[PDB]
Amino acid sequence: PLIVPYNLPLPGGVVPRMLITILGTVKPNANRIALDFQRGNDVAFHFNPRFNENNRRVIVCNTKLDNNWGREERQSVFPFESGKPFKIQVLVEPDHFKVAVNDAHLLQYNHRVKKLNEISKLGISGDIDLTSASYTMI
Amino acid sequence: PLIVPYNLPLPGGVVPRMLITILGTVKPNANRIALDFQRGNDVAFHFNPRFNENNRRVIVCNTKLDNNWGREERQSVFPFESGKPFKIQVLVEPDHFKVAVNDAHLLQYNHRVKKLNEISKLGISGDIDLTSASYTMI
Ligand SMILES: Cc1nc([C@@H]2O[C@@H](CO)[C@H](O)[C@H](n3cc(-c4cc(F)c(Cl)c(F)c4)nn3)[C@H]2OCC(=O)N2CCN(C(=O)CO[C@@H]3[C@@H](n4cc(-c5cc(F)c(Cl)c(F)c5)nn4)[C@@H](O)[C@@H](CO)O[C@H]3c3nc(C)nn3-c3cc(Cl)ccc3Cl)CC2)n(-c2cc(Cl)ccc2Cl)n1
Ligand SMILES: [Cl-]
Ligand SMILES: [Cl-]
């Protein structure tokens, strides 16, 4: 049972072939979840399941540069379920992040922050019980 | 130079005579700051300087329980200055939090979440460069 928000420092920084695995359960009354790949106060990749953005479920992805969010990438395929276990995997490729939820490909996010090595940590926040957060190279 | 949003776990939980000190600089075009004393999925005490709430500066304080905000406490005495250093100290008393900014008493916030020792962490977010965040007992 990890404390949320949970900070996953990436000691040597993001590199292609890094594979991150997050296991947890969605809280019963969840509203929001966020994963934030950070380069300083910039957010290279924000992955944000919203359970009730006006009584809809959506995944919103974006980048925050100088405290300004950029173009939103939205999608409606929403694999999370209130009260239920989930698995998120993020695979870093040269040109994008790949995200798979519950072993199924969910989305790709093209890198906007190009200095991959400078992304130093993953923040995991929001309405989950967090079971595990880890990283390796594959 | 901490990463914002920054989460300061409070090992052992909030108790009276806990003193929290936050140091940083307000960004030059700041819009908002928030300190959130968190209890589980709730916010026992949200302290929220708004630099541009319809072209007025105001401090809003409130509590979030089961995702509902409560009664707002608003005040106009506004000690932050865009692009300038600040110091916030919060002293926990049995009946309220005391907040001082730049060594001067600013406000009190009477406890609404009475289970003080379940308040486990302080989140610090918004348009700041965060230099330090710490706690001790006095
Ligand atoms: C709708 C929207 N959302 C975004 C923006 O978009 C994203 C990327 O494109 C990104 O996902 C954002 N983001 C996600 C997270 C996040 C953080 C987190 F911890 C978890 Cl766990 C998580 F899963 C996700 N962080 N950033 C998304 O930004 C969200 C956003 O800006 N806000 C959330 C919705 N709003 C409120 O709830 C405001 O309500 C206030 C309330 N308060 C203040 C804050 C706050 C948060 C914060 F981080 C900082 Cl730095 C602050 F300084 C403050 N959070 N909640 C309180 O202050 C109460 C006090 O009484 O008042 C609420 C209020 N305000 C008004 C006008 N009314 N009320 C209110 C009061 C009461 Cl009593 C009752 C009811 C109400 Cl409604 C605002 C904050 N964007 C977006 C996208 C883009 Cl591309 C560009 C710009 C924006 Cl804004 N739009
Ligand atoms: Cl949000
Ligand atoms: Cl806001």
Swiss-Prot record, chains A, B:
A motif (Nuclear export signal) lies at residues 114-129. Residues 6-136 form the Galectin domain. The modification Phosphoserine is found at residue 76. A major expression is found in the colonic epithelium. It is also abundant in the activated macrophages. Expressed in fetal membranes. It comes from the Eukaryota. A beta-D-galactoside binds at residues 69-75. Probably forms homo- or heterodimers. Interacts with DMBT1. Interacts with CD6 and ALCAM. Forms a complex with the ITGA3, ITGB1 and CSPG4. Interacts with LGALS3BP, LYPD3, ZFTRAF1 and UACA. Interacts with TRIM16; this interaction mediates autophagy of damage endomembranes. Interacts with cargo receptor TMED10; the interaction mediates the translocation from the cytoplasm into the ERGIC (endoplasmic reticulum-Golgi intermediate compartment) and thereby secretion. Galactose-specific lectin which binds IgE. May mediate with the alpha-3, beta-1 integrin the stimulation by CSPG4 of endothelial cells migration. Together with DMBT1, required for terminal differentiation of columnar epithelial cells during early embryogenesis. In the nucleus: acts as a pre-mRNA splicing factor. Involved in acute inflammatory responses including neutrophil activation and adhesion, chemoattraction of monocytes macrophages, opsonization of apoptotic neutrophils, and activation of mast cells. This is Galectin-3. It comes from Homo sapiens (Human). The lineage of its organism: Eukaryota, Metazoa, Chordata, Craniata, Vertebrata. The chain holds residues 113 to 250 of 250 of the full protein.
